[PDB]
RNA sequence: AGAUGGUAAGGGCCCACGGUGGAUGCCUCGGCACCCGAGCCGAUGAAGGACGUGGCUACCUGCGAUAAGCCAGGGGG
RNA sequence: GGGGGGAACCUGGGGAACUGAAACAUCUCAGUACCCAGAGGAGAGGAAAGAGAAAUCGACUCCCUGAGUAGCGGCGAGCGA
RNA sequence: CUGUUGGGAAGCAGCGCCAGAGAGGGUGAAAGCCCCGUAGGCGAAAGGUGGGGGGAUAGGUGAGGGUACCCGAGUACCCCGUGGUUCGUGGAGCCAUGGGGGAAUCUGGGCGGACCACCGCCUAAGGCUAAGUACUCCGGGUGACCGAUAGCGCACCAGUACCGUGAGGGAAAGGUGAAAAGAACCCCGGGAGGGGAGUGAAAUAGAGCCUGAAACCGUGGGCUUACAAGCAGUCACGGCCCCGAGGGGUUGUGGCGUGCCUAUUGAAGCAUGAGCCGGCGACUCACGGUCGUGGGCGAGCUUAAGCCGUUGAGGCGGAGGCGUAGGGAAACCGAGUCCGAACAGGGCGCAGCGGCCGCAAAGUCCGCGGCCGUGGACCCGAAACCGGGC
RNA sequence: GCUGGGGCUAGGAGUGAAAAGCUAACCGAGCCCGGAGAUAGCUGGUUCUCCCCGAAAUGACUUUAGGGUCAGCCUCAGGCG
RNA sequence: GGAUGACCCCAGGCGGUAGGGGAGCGUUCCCGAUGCCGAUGAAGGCCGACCCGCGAGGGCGGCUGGAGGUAAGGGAAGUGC
RNA sequence: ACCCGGUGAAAUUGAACUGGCCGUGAAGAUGCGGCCUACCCGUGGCAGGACGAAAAGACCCCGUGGAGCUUUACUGCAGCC
């Protein structure tokens, strides 16, 4: 297999669209821009995600809701992430927050909360909280719930 | 700093390329700015001269045309072969050209 | 440069699990004395923004 | 995956050769050249010579049909560019460690 | 009676050759970008100039009435 | 000892407008352009009357990230630790 | 090295050789071995540097106990006016300070976002401090950078000519040939210019010089044209001329026939633009996003800066990011959750294929393409506004 | 009164027996360079070929009306059938 | 039909502005390339009533030119007036 | 002004092989229809036409364009109290 053989698969490298290059291309003259007006101009229109021609926008007519926060900003309080029993399936022996981080299950800087989707497995699971149904499934399967503080 | 010339006035050179390939001759002159040598009786050209005090009767003269120095090879005075040149340090220790075929000085 | 989150959108709207856009019913900020109870109550819920409008708002929230 | 597949491609063509060490090559092109001939490399086919032996690389590097590399340098363009792959065992060892 | 051809002052199309003009290709003394290196000069008068300076010298370079240069070390041949 | 010069770079003292906000004043552009002073091969900053929640860290500078987060905002356009 | 073609060998052919050097440039064409180089090595009396090595010097270093002397003042601190911070007066702290008032020395003071308490952090009102960082006038290396309308404004005697009182503006302009062998001498001519002669492989390579397009001007030839009506062509036939059951050129007659572009409801239009020709001339790039698509891995995917290596070699680096759970303004609960008295109702949510194997896939990374956001964002054009100068 | 020479006053400024006159051949705000590629919802221009499909000039709203947002109408890919 | 885009057969569609989509041509540059074409003549220019291609184009021939050019397959854009 | 010798511009210019009528046509036709008329090419003259040339209408309107000016428009600043 040699340099002359190396080919990208079909569709892997598509040509770009070139406008403003003659009549046969069917993108000549106006360059697919239509005729005249703001959108044909260099610079074009306002943020069409928001602006609506001068009338008050869809967005700005809906009510704000809830606590938006104040200076000096977010209040530091402990944060919990749940991981379900089913995600604990893969482990044997002990699970702790740290292992769960490594598995790519628990994100750093969150506390562990175990949740109920799935089946419990007789493991020693150490966490900051358990849901009602998690505790239940866990006790019943002869696993061992351990609270951290 | 200086142009490198592997050949000089008037060691004996073989003309190794061009119309005169094969000829042997003394280097009458070295022109480093043009990187060229004049070899005796090699590269003759017919130049027109005006009827002048220097040349009354006018007509033409023969002149030696310069050769690009790379066309030329010194002939070793010991072995008589055309050669590349090497440098050898003496005891002085001045340095000198020596033939690359045998070890002979080229001056 | 990276896109900026539109703060009026972040403050008015939420993108649901399946990407619908949700906002509070408009119309009971005030002038409510003569509104029926069916009215005030119904305006107290969230509704799901019309597709083309939600689709626009969704693009202003590039990192939710 | 690419590194592996490229070597694999040569392996599948018989064009990959592993070697224990290099006889008399002690940094001279004629020395490598000897050895090479003796090992079935007449220079009619381009060779990616991979070895950690500096002495062997210098010896082979001036040959127009030889491209040389340390084993840490092995890469797919070089494998694919050349017709034949030649490795030290020690070279081959790191490549195995690299594709692991 | 009838009927039809040779006129070219000049013009038009085509072909050949030229003139004009300086495209195109090739070229590169120059430019550009990045990376590395290096980074202050000046009253001991800088930067930057003026005028000079060659046997003959318009200009450029170099140089300063010791004026394309003076002395000394090193390099080179 | 100073004075004057130096392409960018740097600090400090001053400091716009077009423009954007589909008009405009707050806001933006922007502490940008520009003027001035000063340095120097860099300049600035620097050895906690710090950070800010950890029973923690440990001068300053510079890069990645944190994060378009927190927030700020005719809660508009936008701005942004 | 030799032979050969050739003006010229480095081409082709024969037989060799070097290589830690087959980077590259030259040489009359295309050269590893002819030249300059290249790999690998070597080199400073003098000046400069010297963050590395060595040495010196300055400087550095105790423990209880007592005393309560000192510990940076128009300062802290409070109020007023402001600036800085993400903070636009906000619940507005902090840092800074123009005005007023105005302390204390560790049992002192500042701070942890008004304030108070508690619990902590830190020691203001004196100074210095390498390095890691920015830049590129200068030197060098290197380009999926330009190649004379490009690339710097300038390849060239250019910040010049020229323009402007001035600040300031600001060009054009490269190429004989391998070598000048740059055309002695004769002829016509006042000269310019040419014609011979000569040089050269070549002279429509002759210096007004490589190539030498097009518009434009001419000479010569073929066909045609002075009763004809025209977007200039087209279709047909016939004549003549040319190259040789065919073609080509030309055009007499007959048929048909309203330029191009632009903008418009609508143009041949008496609506725009264009004298003709050559060259320059307008949908891109970064970073984010969204979909689509080619692959990699898949409950996971992926690294950034940096570090090591290379000198067109890759690797390391898991900090971080996205995903794996949602609902709720939030506390918070969680395959649920929110409203609610509700075990009500509702909103928003939750649930592969084949034979343990393979296959597919959430997702995510990279490439490619479309479109979006931010930038001047497809190119060209104002009238104006502002700064500093003249 | 006219005039030579030497001087001073300038850009929101001068100067003006007043005309918005004149301030270096266009002054209801001089010229140069800079912000700067200001902005231009306007006008103009937008470059190779073939093939398939193929609109709109409406409705709502709009300091909107020769500009937009959504919808209608065109096209592509996937699914349904 | 054959198995697959080999090509044959039958049928049907194929006016087109804005505009969507598809497939191609050509220009500069990179890998391919220490290769290959090249003074028995590179590029470029001027002819051509010939060959291939729907076309954009690509060949081949003659003349000019006098030293460069560059494939199959890929890659990237200062790419077509 | 005209003729002969000398020197020798300009705007403008899609190309032109550039007649009249009555009609037709985006509504004022050398260029379309039907007719009429008309051999080729100039020189001096005239100005009816080529909606002749020049100048991207200065009037008018449009642009959420500009600028000068005004005031018991709004908001600020100098200045003064
Ligand atoms: Mg691409
Ligand atoms: Mg086209
Ligand atoms: Mg298309
Ligand atoms: Mg179209
Ligand atoms: Mg067009
Ligand atoms: Mg347009
Ligand atoms: Mg379009
Ligand atoms: Mg478009
Ligand atoms: Mg348009
Ligand atoms: Mg339209
Ligand atoms: Mg247009
Ligand atoms: Mg318009
Ligand atoms: Mg439009
Ligand atoms: Mg436009
Ligand atoms: Mg613009
Ligand atoms: Mg615009
Ligand atoms: Mg309104
Ligand atoms: Mg928040
Ligand atoms: Mg147990
Ligand atoms: Mg020497
Ligand atoms: Mg001989
Ligand atoms: Mg010596
Ligand atoms: Mg309400
Ligand atoms: Mg309200
Ligand atoms: Mg309320
Ligand atoms: Mg209220
Ligand atoms: Mg009622
Ligand atoms: Mg009502
Ligand atoms: Mg009621
Ligand atoms: Mg995030
Ligand atoms: Mg989410
Ligand atoms: Mg090699
Ligand atoms: Mg190779
Ligand atoms: Mg007759
Ligand atoms: Mg005739
Ligand atoms: Mg005649
Ligand atoms: Mg004719
Ligand atoms: Mg000619
Ligand atoms: Mg080239
Ligand atoms: Mg310097
Ligand atoms: Mg000087
Ligand atoms: Mg001089
Ligand atoms: Mg000396
Ligand atoms: Mg000496
Ligand atoms: Mg000073
Ligand atoms: Mg100084
Ligand atoms: Mg400042
Ligand atoms: Mg100061
Ligand atoms: Mg300031
Ligand atoms: Mg400043
Ligand atoms: Mg000011
Ligand atoms: Mg403003
Ligand atoms: Mg702007
Ligand atoms: Mg904007
Ligand atoms: Mg505005
Ligand atoms: Mg606007
Ligand atoms: Mg206005
Ligand atoms: Mg404004
Ligand atoms: Mg802006
Ligand atoms: Mg600001
Ligand atoms: Mg600047
Ligand atoms: Mg200074
Ligand atoms: Mg430094
Ligand atoms: Mg420093
Ligand atoms: Mg310092
Ligand atoms: Mg201290
Ligand atoms: Mg984050
Ligand atoms: Mg808001
Ligand atoms: Mg700011
Ligand atoms: Mg011969
Ligand atoms: Mg030979
Ligand atoms: Mg040979
Ligand atoms: Mg090398
Ligand atoms: Mg080479
Ligand atoms: Mg070479
Ligand atoms: Mg030659
Ligand atoms: Mg060769
Ligand atoms: Mg070559
Ligand atoms: Mg060579
Ligand atoms: Mg070396
Ligand atoms: Mg060396
Ligand atoms: Mg003590
Ligand atoms: Mg005391
Ligand atoms: Mg103190
Ligand atoms: Mg004091
Ligand atoms: Mg204060
Ligand atoms: Mg502030
Ligand atoms: Mg507030
Ligand atoms: Mg505050
Ligand atoms: Mg104070
Ligand atoms: Mg205390
Ligand atoms: Mg106290
Ligand atoms: Mg304080
Ligand atoms: Mg305080
Ligand atoms: Mg406090
Ligand atoms: Mg604190
Ligand atoms: Mg503290
Ligand atoms: Mg300091
Ligand atoms: Mg240090
Ligand atoms: Mg530093
Ligand atoms: Mg640097
Ligand atoms: Mg440089
Ligand atoms: Mg080149
Ligand atoms: Mg030129
Ligand atoms: Mg130029
Ligand atoms: Mg040229
Ligand atoms: Mg220059
Ligand atoms: Mg020039
Ligand atoms: Mg000049
Ligand atoms: Mg002037
Ligand atoms: Mg002048
Ligand atoms: Mg100017
Ligand atoms: Mg010019
Ligand atoms: Mg030459
Ligand atoms: Mg020459
Ligand atoms: Mg004569
Ligand atoms: Mg005479
Ligand atoms: Mg003569
Ligand atoms: Mg003659
Ligand atoms: Mg002659
Ligand atoms: Mg001859
Ligand atoms: Mg020949
Ligand atoms: Mg010729
Ligand atoms: Mg020639
Ligand atoms: Mg010429
Ligand atoms: Mg030549
Ligand atoms: Mg010529
Ligand atoms: Mg010519
Ligand atoms: Mg011609
Ligand atoms: Mg004729
Ligand atoms: Mg008649
Ligand atoms: Mg007749
Ligand atoms: Mg006809
Ligand atoms: Mg017929
Ligand atoms: Mg015929
Ligand atoms: Mg015929
Ligand atoms: Mg015909
Ligand atoms: Mg008939
Ligand atoms: Mg017509
Ligand atoms: Mg018609
Ligand atoms: Mg056309
Ligand atoms: Mg037009
Ligand atoms: Mg129009
Ligand atoms: Mg109109
Ligand atoms: Mg109209
Ligand atoms: Mg017409
Ligand atoms: Mg008409
Ligand atoms: Mg007309
Ligand atoms: Mg008109
Ligand atoms: Mg017209
Ligand atoms: Mg118009
Ligand atoms: Mg013109
Ligand atoms: Mg013409
Ligand atoms: Mg053209
Ligand atoms: Mg685009
Ligand atoms: Mg994309
Ligand atoms: Mg993707
Ligand atoms: Mg992968
Ligand atoms: Mg998979
Ligand atoms: Mg992210
Ligand atoms: Mg429910
Ligand atoms: Mg439900
Ligand atoms: Mg995937
Ligand atoms: Mg889009
Ligand atoms: Mg921009
Ligand atoms: Mg742009
Ligand atoms: Mg764009
Ligand atoms: Mg502009
Ligand atoms: Mg003005
Ligand atoms: Mg104004
Ligand atoms: Mg103003
Ligand atoms: Mg000004
Ligand atoms: Mg001023
Ligand atoms: Mg006077
Ligand atoms: Mg005077
Ligand atoms: Mg006077
Ligand atoms: Mg005055
Ligand atoms: Mg004045
Ligand atoms: Mg002034
Ligand atoms: Mg003014
Ligand atoms: Mg005023
Ligand atoms: Mg003004
Ligand atoms: Mg005034
Ligand atoms: Mg007066
Ligand atoms: Mg008046
Ligand atoms: Mg002036
Ligand atoms: Mg005037
Ligand atoms: Mg004004
Ligand atoms: Mg004036
Ligand atoms: Mg300036
Ligand atoms: Mg700006
Ligand atoms: Mg701009
Ligand atoms: Mg504006
Ligand atoms: Mg375009
Ligand atoms: Mg159709
Ligand atoms: Mg309408
Ligand atoms: Mg409508
Ligand atoms: Mg309504
Ligand atoms: Mg509406
Ligand atoms: Mg329109
Ligand atoms: Mg409009
Ligand atoms: Mg739409
Ligand atoms: Mg439909
Ligand atoms: Mg479909
Ligand atoms: Mg058919
Ligand atoms: Mg079809
Ligand atoms: Mg049909
Ligand atoms: Mg069609
Ligand atoms: Mg298609
Ligand atoms: Mg396509
Ligand atoms: Mg092709
Ligand atoms: Mg092309
Ligand atoms: Mg292509
Ligand atoms: Mg390149
Ligand atoms: Mg190569
Ligand atoms: Mg080559
Ligand atoms: Mg050959
Ligand atoms: Mg030849
Ligand atoms: Mg030939
Ligand atoms: Mg080329
Ligand atoms: Mg070519
Ligand atoms: Mg052709
Ligand atoms: Mg040719
Ligand atoms: Mg060459
Ligand atoms: Mg190529
Ligand atoms: Mg290729
Ligand atoms: Mg490739
Ligand atoms: Mg372009
Ligand atoms: Mg007469
Ligand atoms: Mg006359
Ligand atoms: Mg005509
Ligand atoms: Mg006529
Ligand atoms: Mg009518
Ligand atoms: Mg009529
Ligand atoms: Mg007529
Ligand atoms: Mg007609
Ligand atoms: Mg008629
Ligand atoms: Mg007629
Ligand atoms: Mg008539
Ligand atoms: Mg006349
Ligand atoms: Mg008339
Ligand atoms: Mg008249
Ligand atoms: Mg007419
Ligand atoms: Mg008229
Ligand atoms: Mg007119
Ligand atoms: Mg006109
Ligand atoms: Mg205009
Ligand atoms: Mg107009
Ligand atoms: Mg107008
Ligand atoms: Mg008016
Ligand atoms: Mg009007
Ligand atoms: Mg108006
Ligand atoms: Mg308005
Ligand atoms: Mg408007
Ligand atoms: Mg206005
Ligand atoms: Mg105004
Ligand atoms: Mg007063
Ligand atoms: Zn010898």
Swiss-Prot record, chain A:
One of its GO terms (biological process) is translation. The keyword Ribosomal protein applies. GO terms for molecular function: rRNA binding; structural constituent of ribosome. GO terms for cellular component: cytosolic large ribosomal subunit. The keyword RNA-binding applies. Residues 30-39 have a biased composition (Basic residues). Pfam families: Ribosomal_L27A (PF00828). InterPro entries: Ribosomal_uL15 (IPR030878), Ribosomal_uL15/eL18 (IPR021131), Ribosomal_uL15/eL18_sf (IPR036227), Ribosomal_uL15_bac-type (IPR005749), Ribosomal_uL15_CS (IPR001196). PROSITE patterns: RIBOSOMAL_L15 (PS00475). Residues 1-60 are annotated as: Disordered. Keywords: Ribonucleoprotein, Ribosomal protein, RNA-binding, rRNA-binding. Coiled coil: none annotated. Residues 44-53 have a biased composition (Basic and acidic residues). Belongs to the universal ribosomal protein uL15 family. Part of the 50S ribosomal subunit. Binds to the 23S rRNA. This is Large ribosomal subunit protein uL15. It comes from Thermus thermophilus (strain ATCC 27634 / DSM 579 / HB8).
Curated annotation (Swiss-Prot), chain B:
Signal peptide: none annotated. Keywords: Ribonucleoprotein, Ribosomal protein, RNA-binding, rRNA-binding. It comes from the Bacteria. SMART domains: KOW (SM00739). One of its GO terms (cellular component) is ribonucleoprotein complex. GO terms for biological process: translation. InterPro entries: KOW, Rib_uL2_dom2, Ribosomal_uL24, Ribosomal_uL24_CS, Ribosomal_uL24_KOW, Translation_prot_SH3-like_sf. It holds the Pfam family ribosomal_L24. CDD domains: KOW_RPL26. One of its GO terms (molecular function) is structural constituent of ribosome. NCBIfam families: rplX_bact. Part of the 50S ribosomal subunit. Belongs to the universal ribosomal protein uL24 family. One of two assembly initiator proteins, it binds directly to the 5'-end of the 23S rRNA, where it nucleates assembly of the 50S subunit. One of the proteins that surrounds the polypeptide exit tunnel on the outside of the subunit. HAMAP family: Ribosomal_uL24_B. This is Large ribosomal subunit protein uL24. It comes from Thermus thermophilus (strain ATCC 27634 / DSM 579 / HB8).
Curated annotation (Swiss-Prot), chain C:
One of its GO terms (molecular function) is structural constituent of ribosome. Pfam families: Ribosomal_L35p. One of its GO terms (biological process) is translation. InterPro entries: Ribosomal_bL35, Ribosomal_bL35-like, Ribosomal_bL35_CS, Ribosomal_bL35_sf. GO terms for cellular component: cytosolic large ribosomal subunit. Belongs to the bacterial ribosomal protein bL35 family. This is Large ribosomal subunit protein bL35. It comes from Thermus thermophilus (strain ATCC 27634 / DSM 579 / HB8).
UniProtKB/Swiss-Prot annotation, chain D:
Part of the 50S ribosomal subunit. One of the primary rRNA binding proteins, this protein initially binds near the 5'-end of the 23S rRNA. It is important during the early stages of 50S assembly. It makes multiple contacts with different domains of the 23S rRNA in the assembled 50S subunit and ribosome. Forms part of the polypeptide exit tunnel. Belongs to the universal ribosomal protein uL4 family. Keywords: Ribonucleoprotein, Ribosomal protein, RNA-binding, rRNA-binding. This is Large ribosomal subunit protein uL4. The chain holds residues 108 to 207 of 210 of the full protein. The N-terminus is blocked. GO terms for molecular function: rRNA binding; structural constituent of ribosome.
